[PDB]
Amino acid sequence: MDNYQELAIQFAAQAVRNEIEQWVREFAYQGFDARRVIELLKQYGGADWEKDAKKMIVLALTRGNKPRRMMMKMSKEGKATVEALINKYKLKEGNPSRDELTLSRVAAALAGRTCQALVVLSEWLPVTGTTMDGLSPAYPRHMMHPSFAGMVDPSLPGDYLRAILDAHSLYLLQFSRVINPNLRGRTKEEVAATFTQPMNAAVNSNFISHEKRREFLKAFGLVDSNGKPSAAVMAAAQAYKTAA
Amino acid sequence: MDNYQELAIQFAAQAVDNEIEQWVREFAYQGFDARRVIELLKQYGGADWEKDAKKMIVLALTRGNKPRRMMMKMSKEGKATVEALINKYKLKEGNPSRDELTLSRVAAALAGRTCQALVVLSEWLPVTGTTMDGLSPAYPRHMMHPSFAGMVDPSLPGDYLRAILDAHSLYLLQFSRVINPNLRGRTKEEVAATFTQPMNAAVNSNFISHEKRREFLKAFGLVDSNGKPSAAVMAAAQAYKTAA
């Protein structure tokens, strides 16, 4: 199997409790620079920073943003690996100062890697690809994480951009209601008020150029060489226009 | 997550296995009535037979056809579950006599359940959905097991029928090459000779009606109300026609 999945298995809980603690803060403001995250990873990790970052991406996508808590129900190998990560990278929780690493900051700084992992880790996420397919056929797995907004090129023609973000907002809507039970009984407009802000921030950040971002979107199958969105993105976008 | 995945996790090896041997003999002749298999499941399993069958499908798809061997590297919880299955169902390996159960026969006799499970278990299989997507985009997950042949309605219009079996044959070509690596360097038609006869036997067997099979194919999204294959089936059939 793909090594992303091998890692997901190493880090799975023996059973499921206070799971909601792991995800509830996902759209809470984060004050950091992606460049600084990468510097800190290299500084603490040496040449193995990339291998270690991969483990942290699996943790962020499949278990949450609280490394110490997620160790509690892990296998012995799992716990050991996570404890070594915490100690090497000095991992924190929540929204620490700007020179600290968290699992979510790592996932977000390596957005290109994170989103490519979503193709393999689809059935391990809070909202699965199968669940998204019920809302729109062939939903793009590369969109199934908040860090995807950092892959969006804002210089795409306006109609192509709006489709990409609309398609992605379909997953954000679902994900938001799952991770935050306070939003389950709410309208799309009220839920969108909670995820549009950090979304638009990453869309317009200076981390990863327009050109590089668009290369990722083309490599992910989400746009063609003209920037025109795939039929699956188009179907997702319209599904979001009339979503409840 | 979906319960099929929770089961796959419970049954996962702590490390990889001589793993090839779990999967060899997949296309080896099988002398069983699927009706007899179901009779034996009901006799040994009683009212919980379907719940136990679910577990055995997960083992057959993700771990192989040798129950004693696959336990060796499982968790204590997994091992205990598989032990209780061996003793309750009297599970055998290889191609035993007609009144014996194996994990492969269970999967095949419950083809309709097995093929639906592939949607969730794609990334656990010896050939993953992501690998198939490399060969033809949006490759149908429901086709990704030899037991799919028992879901094919032979009364489909010849053209539609050929598209469904050509689409499914794209998977079998890949799968045969994973279980016998020597077939990687053999021509497509040489590899097809190793899988076509058992495929055709299942297509033409008397188990599950033309009508019920076509309903499954419609429920699986592989054909429409009139038997016409989906766009992704048609692309996979064409890919098989050009495949190495």
DSSP chain A: --HHHHHHHHT-BS----THHHHTTTTS-----HHHHHHHHHHHHGGGHHHHHHHHHHHHHHT-S-HHHHHTTB-HHHHHHHHHHHHHHT---SS--TT---HHHHHHHTHHHHHHHHHHHGGGSSS-HHHHHHHSTT--GGGSSGGGGGG--TTS-HHHHHHHHHHHHHHHHHHHHHH-GGGTTS-HHHHHHHHHHHHHHHHTSSSS-HHHHHHHHHHTTSB-TT-PBPHHHHHHHHHHHT--
In angstroms, the CA B147 to CA A164 distance is: 38
Q: Determine the residue among A123, A230, A233 to mutate to test chain B binding: the one whose Cβ has the most chain B Cβ atoms within 10 Å.
A: A123
CA distance B3 to B116: 13
Alpha-carbon dihedral sign for residues B206, B145, B73, B81: negative
Tell whether A3 is within 8 A of chain B (Cβ): no
What tokens appear for A196 in the block? 């549009």
Two tokens, residue A155: 């210089």
Q: What is the CA radius of gyration of chain A?
A: 17
Closest CA to A149 of A197, A105, A202: A202
Nearest chain B Cα distance for residue A208, angstroms: 26
Sign of CA dihedral B218, B224, B226, B228: negative
Q: Out of B9, B128, B138, whose CB is closest to A9? A: B9
Q: Is B38 on the interface with A (CB under 8 A)?
A: no
Closest partner residue to B119 (CB to CB) among A77, A130, A138 is A130
For CA atoms A130, A136, A138, A140, the dihedral sign is: negative
Q: How far apart are CA A120 and CA B241, in angstroms?
A: 27
> A124 — contact with chain B (CB < 8 Å)?
yes
User: How far apart, in Å, are the Cα atoms of B98 and each of B30, B35, B147?
Assistant: 9, 11, 18
Farthest-apart Cα atoms in chain A, separation: 50
> How far is residue A78's CA from residue A59's CA, in Å, rounded to a whole number?
11
Residue A222, min C-alpha distance to chain B (Å):
13
> A8: exposed, middle or buried (C-beta count within 10 Å: 0-12, 13-18, 19+)?
buried
| Beta carbons of B120 and A123 less than 8 Å apart | yes
Question: Using alpha carbons only, what angle is made at residue A139 by residues A138 and A143, rounded to the nearest 5 degrees?
Answer: 145
Cβ-proximal residues to A188 (8 Å cutoff; 6+ apart), any chain:
A173, A243, A244
Return the structure tokens found at B150: 């028992």
Give the CB-side neighbour count of residue A79, counting CA atoms within 13 A. Answer: 9
In contact, A144 and A118? CB cutoff 8 Å: yes
What is the distance between the alpha carbons of residues B134 and B236, in angstroms, rounded to a whole number?
Answer: 11
Q: Measured between CB atoms, which of A75, A77, A123 is closest to B123? A: A123
Q: Please list every residue in chain A whose beta carbon sits closer than 8 Å to the beta carbon of residue B2.
A: 123, 128, 130
User: For chain B, after which residues does the C atom lie more than 2.5 Å from the next written residue's N, i.e. where is it broken?
Assistant: 17
Q: Do A2 and B128 touch (CB under 8 A)?
A: yes
For residue B11, what is the nearest residue in chain A, using CA coordinates? Answer: A9
Question: In 3D, which of B136, B156, B10, B165 has the Cα closest to residue B74?
Answer: B10
Binding residues of B for RNA: 29, 32, 65-66, 69, 98, 104-105, 184, 194
Contact A221 B137 (CB under 8 A): yes
User: Chain A within 8 Å of B224 (Cβ-Cβ)?
Assistant: no
How far is B6 from A15, CA to CA, in rounded Å?
Answer: 9
Instruction: Tell me if chain B has a CB within 8 Å of the CB of A222.
Output: no
Q: How far apart are CA B43 and CA B52, in angstroms?
A: 12
Q: Which of A9, A75, A130 sits opposite B120 (nearest CB)?
A: A130
For residues B130-153, b (16+ Cβ closer than 10 Å) or e, as one string?
A: bbbeebbbbbbbbbbbbbbbbbbb
Check if the beta carbon of residue B52 is closer than 8 Å to that of residue B85: yes
DSSP-derived secondary structure for B19-62:
GGGGTTTTTS-----HHHHHHHHHHHHGGGHHHHHHHHHHHHHH
CA atoms of B179 and A118, how far apart (whole Å): 27
- Cα-Cα-Cα-Cα torsion A121, B54, B23, B96, nearest 10 degrees, comes to 180
Closest of A136, A150, A148, A152 to residue A236, by C-alpha: A136
**Structural contact between residues B134 and B127, judged by C-beta atoms closer than 8 angstroms:** no
Q: A1, B123: Cβ pair inside 8 Å?
A: yes
Partner B contacted by A224 (CB < 8 A)? no
Q: How far apart are alpha carbons B229 and B162 in whole angstroms?
A: 10
Q: Which residues contact A13 (CB under 8 A, 6 or more apart)?
A: A63, A70, A73, A74
SS3 B175: helix
The Cα–Cα gap between A17 and A170 comes to 28
Q: In this complex, is the C-beta atom of B138 within 8 Å of any C-beta atom belonging to chain A?
A: yes
Q: Give the three-state DSSP class for B228.
A: coil
Q: What angle do CA A44, A152, A216 make, to 5 degrees?
A: 70
Question: Of B46, B82, B85, B41, whose CA–CA distance to B63 is shortest?
Answer: B82
Contact yes or no for A149/A203 (Cβ under 8 A): yes
Instruction: Find tokens 């059973």 and name the residue.
Output: A15
Using an 8 Å Cβ cutoff, are B127 and B178 in contact? yes
